[PDB]
Ligand binder design. Structure first.
Ligand code: 7S6
Ligand code: ZN
Length: 297
């Protein structure tokens, strides 16, 4: 059977929040079968635990935020993208501050820390959410769709009226694409012209060329340039895989994003979860007949 996976060993990282600029200690720990991904504010007494599930999403303007009462965990999407990409079902994510560290702006550093620690297969069938019917949400020009598909593939289109903005559409299908090699290293991006305003709104306080592609009038300011010709749209795919993981299980289906973001992605997850005709939970007792496969642990 395709088995649930957790961490073999703990992961420790120290970083800075993109929006808050706060120094943060991150610990990933193994968790039991059917725990899912659970975030924990360990700086609070008592500790506040928030499951990484669509029901717990608050703010989606600046990044994906989990909320329980007045307690928040900001910017979960890059770490959730890493967990979904590597097939991690169960983990406790302890944080000493509200915001997950930004690292280099991609999922690359989290993927490397997790694969160094190693994964542990658990004695329980991995659960998958299988898309059975097309579910689409629109608002203005933006659209997010789930489509039935025997596998897992993600399409994204952005449209920035900017000289720097290259390939603005990309498709990944994990029957060929390596999450690790082709998606995970894609960094977040911000426009230089927006930073002053953002800082006045207490956003991008931790932003630097070390953790983001900074775009000037006409060029990327980063001295070493882009990791991928299509890094901007690859990063939107990375964000989308993280947001999709708020379903609490790996997807069997297709996601298509058309100028979508955290907010429409959340409207799409909420609409899917509510329409129980459009999905079911499936397991695979035989890996050899499954439409997806995962790296050795
Ligand atoms: C254009 C923007 C509205 C958008 O649609 N985005 C889609 C992508 N979203 C994501 O990737 C999500 C949301 C979070 F970004 C993480 N996951 C990307 C980007 C975004 O939200 N980007 C957010 C953002 C905003 C600002 C910065 C920055 C910065 C910065 C600030 C200062 C400095 C230092 N100096 C300042 C003076 O001039 C020289 C440099 C450097 C960088 C990064 C990301
Ligand atoms: Zn992002």
């Amino acid at each position: 059977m395709i088995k649930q996976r957790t961490l073999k060993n703990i992961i420790r990282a120290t970083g800075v929040g993109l929006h808050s600029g706060e120094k943060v200690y991150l610990t990933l720990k193994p968790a039991p079968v059917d725990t899912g991904i659970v975030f924990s504010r360990t700086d609070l007494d008592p500790v506040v635990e928030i499951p990484a599930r669509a029901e717990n999403v608050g703010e989606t303007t600046m990044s994906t935020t989990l909320v329980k009462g007045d307690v928040k965990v900001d910017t979960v999407e890059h770490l959730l993208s890493a967990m979904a990409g590597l097939g991690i079902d169960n983990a406790y994510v302890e944080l000493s501050a509200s915001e997950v560290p930004i690292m280099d702006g991609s999922a690359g550093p989290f993927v490397f820390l997790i694969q160094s620690a190693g994964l542990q297969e658990q004695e329980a069938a991995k659960k998958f959410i299988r898309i059975k019917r097309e579910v689409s949400v629109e608002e203005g020009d933006k659209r997010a769709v789930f489509v039935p598909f025997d596998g897992f593939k993600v399409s994204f289109e952005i449209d920035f009226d900017h000289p720097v903005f290259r390939t603005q559409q990309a498709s990944v299908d994990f029957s060929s694409t390596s999450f690790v090699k082709e998606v995970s290293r894609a960094r977040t991006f911000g426009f230089m012209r927006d930073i002053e305003y953002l800082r006045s709104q207490n956003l991008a306080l931790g932003g630097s060329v070390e953790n983001a592609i900074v775009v000037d009038e006409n060029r990327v300011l980063n001295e070493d340039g882009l990791r991928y010709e299509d890094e901007f749209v690859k990063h939107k795919i990375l964000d989308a895989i993280g947001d999709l993981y708020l379903l609490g299980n790996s997807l069997i289906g297709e996601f298509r994003g058309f100028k979508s973001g955290h907010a429409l992605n959340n409207q799409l997850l909420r609409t899917l979860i509510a329409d129980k005709d459009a999905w079911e939970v499936v397991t695979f007792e035989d890996a050899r007949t499954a439409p997806i496969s995962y790296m050795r642990p």
